[PDB]
């Protein structure tokens, strides 16, 4: 503060002007070839055709996800990094406690080649694996869709049914309850054991828990990010022997401790 | 050329120095805002002089990655999450062509497996969601099913169709009017005339949908959201 503070601030202004001038000169020397980085224009939630996505309070939507148009997402659901939910020509509905994994595409159609064109309906407690493609089809509650699987228009995945990782499910195919289908084209592989039904449920609840920590981290402000960076650096290593000499016990701050429901045990 | 790269390199020295000077100036004023972790994603990215040339009438989603020498024609559209990387060779997209969400159009990263082929996409082409195109040619008015993979040297002739989830092996030629699918991709049947009509009309519909999404994205960034993010506690 005071006169010294003001003088140092003015000198800082001069230094900033000089630095930005040097940056401009360096840009000129590069032949202006470098496209400049800019403010991020990606919108996590966007309207189109006067349709606004309806997203429940406690839904993790990763900032890099794209939720566009007429999309409804229920309680406890999670949309992960790089997901695209494009509800522009038709409706997309996601039930409660359903996870849409990273880099997944969900889309709809305005008019199919033949039959009744239907919206994309994803039920409750559904797991959809990484990089899946869901197009104009219906996934009923407690179903599992493997990573990298493709569901074409009119496909119905029934309750407690599984689509294996990597499968290509042709248009209008029906996956009956209790069966697992896979391959390209997808076809019946075998019945689902009871332990696998329990797995599907477990998948869904584990995701519900994972979504909480990811949502908490992605929503932190600049100041909290800096505070936690400093705290993480301070507690990354230890000298418990010198602490015992000092007669103190350093405790990990609670903002660095994860909840027990996401820990391996 | 070599002189251009030398000046580009020297330019980086000057720029690095100027930005460091600016950070010093901010530090003297007690500002730490340069420490903020802000995304360095660029929708269009140059690799030295190899830069994307995009037509003014083409929609490119902000989250898409266009890297190096990539040409996009009028009325064409690059959708959300798409990646187009032409650095070792070029990638060209014709007019009225849609590249759907999460698709990947790239060339061989190295010439170890031989000369790196370019990727040529003709006019009024549909490239389905999450398709992979790797150093191939896709002629006008063809259909690439979503989730399909086309390897280098492949040629998809006009009105050809690649079924969803197909794996077209290296150097395979897809003849006109034919539907190929499966892993490996094989002849399935002939294309019907209704399918040709749907190819054209779906492409024209995508160009209109592109227009709508480009207008949506071009709207000014909301200042209320900015203030909400700034004033969080």
């Amino acid at each position: 503060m005071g006169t010294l503070g003001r003088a140092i601030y003015t000198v800082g202004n001069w230094i900033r002007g000089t630095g930005q001038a040097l940056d401009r000169v360096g840009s000129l020397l590069q032949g202006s070839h470098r496209i400049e980085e800019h403010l991020s224009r990606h919108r996590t939630l966007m309207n189109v055709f006067d349709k606004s996505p309806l997203v429940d309070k406690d839904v993790f939507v990763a900032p890099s996800a794209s939720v566009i148009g007429d999309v409804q997402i229920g309680k406890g659901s999670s949309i992960w990094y790089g997901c695209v939910l494009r509800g522009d020509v038709n409706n997309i509905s996601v039930g409660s406690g359903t996870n849409i994994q990273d880099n997944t595409l969900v889309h709809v159609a305005k008019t199919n080649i033949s039959g009744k064109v239907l919206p994309t309906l994803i039920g409750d407690n559904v797991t959809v694996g990484h990089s899946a493609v869901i197009h104009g089809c219906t996934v009923e509650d407690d179903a599992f869709v493997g990573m990298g699987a493709t569901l074409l228009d009119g496909v119905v995945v029934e309750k407690h049914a599984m689509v294996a990782a990597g499968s290509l499910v042709k248009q209008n195919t029906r996956i009956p309850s209790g069966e697992v289908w896979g391959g390209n084209p997808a076809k019946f592989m075998r019945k689902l054991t009871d332990e696998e039904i329990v797995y599907i449920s477990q998948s869904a609840k584990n995701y519900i828990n994972l979504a909480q920590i990811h949502a908490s981290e992605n929503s932190k402000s600049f100041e909290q990010i800096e505070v936690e960076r400093a705290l993480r650096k301070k507690y990354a290593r230890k000298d418990e022997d010198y602490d015992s000499m000092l007669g103190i016990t350093r405790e990990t701050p609670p903002e660095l401790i994860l909840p027990d429901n996401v820990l391996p045990g | 050329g070599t002189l251009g790269r030398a000046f580009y390199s020297v330019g980086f020295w000057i720029r690095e120095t100027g930005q460091a000077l600016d950070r010093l100036g901010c530090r003297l004023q007690g500002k730490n805002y340069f420490r903020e972790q802000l995304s360095r994603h660029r929708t269009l990215m140059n690799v030295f002089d190899k830069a994307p040339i995009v037509d003014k009438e083409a929609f490119v989603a902000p989250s898409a990655s266009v890297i190096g020498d990539v040409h996009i024609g009028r009325g064409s559209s690059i959708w959300y999450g798409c990646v187009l990387r032409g650095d070792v060779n070029t990638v060209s997209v014709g007019s009225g062509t849609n590249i759907q969400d999460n698709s990947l159009v790239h060339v061989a990263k190295s010439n170890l497996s031989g000369k790196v082929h370019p990727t040529i996409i003709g006019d009024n082409v549909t490239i389905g969601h999450s398709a992979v195109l790797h150093g191939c040619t896709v002629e006008d008015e063809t259909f690439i099913g979503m989730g399909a993979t086309l390897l280098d040297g492949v040629v998809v002739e006009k009105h050809g169709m690649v079924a969803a989830g197909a794996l077209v092996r290296q150097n395979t030629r897809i003849p006109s009017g034919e539907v190929w699918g499966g892993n490996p991709a094989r002849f399935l049947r002939k294309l019907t005339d209704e399918e040709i009509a749907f190819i054209s009309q779906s492409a024209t519909n995508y160009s209109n949908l592109a227009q709508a999404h480009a207008a949506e994205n071009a709207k000014p960034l909301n200042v209320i959201e900015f203030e909400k993010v700034l004033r969080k506690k």
Partner: peptide
């Protein structure tokens, strides 16, 4: 308008004094 961290300002003065005094030390020797 003003830098408020007093200790930082004092350190800035100390660095400036070191630089200028070093220049004078070289010049007058």
């Amino acid at each position: 308008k003003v830098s408020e961290d007093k200790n930082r300002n004092y350190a800035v003065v100390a660095g400036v004094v070191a630089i200028v005094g070093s220049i004078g030390w070289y010049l007058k020797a």
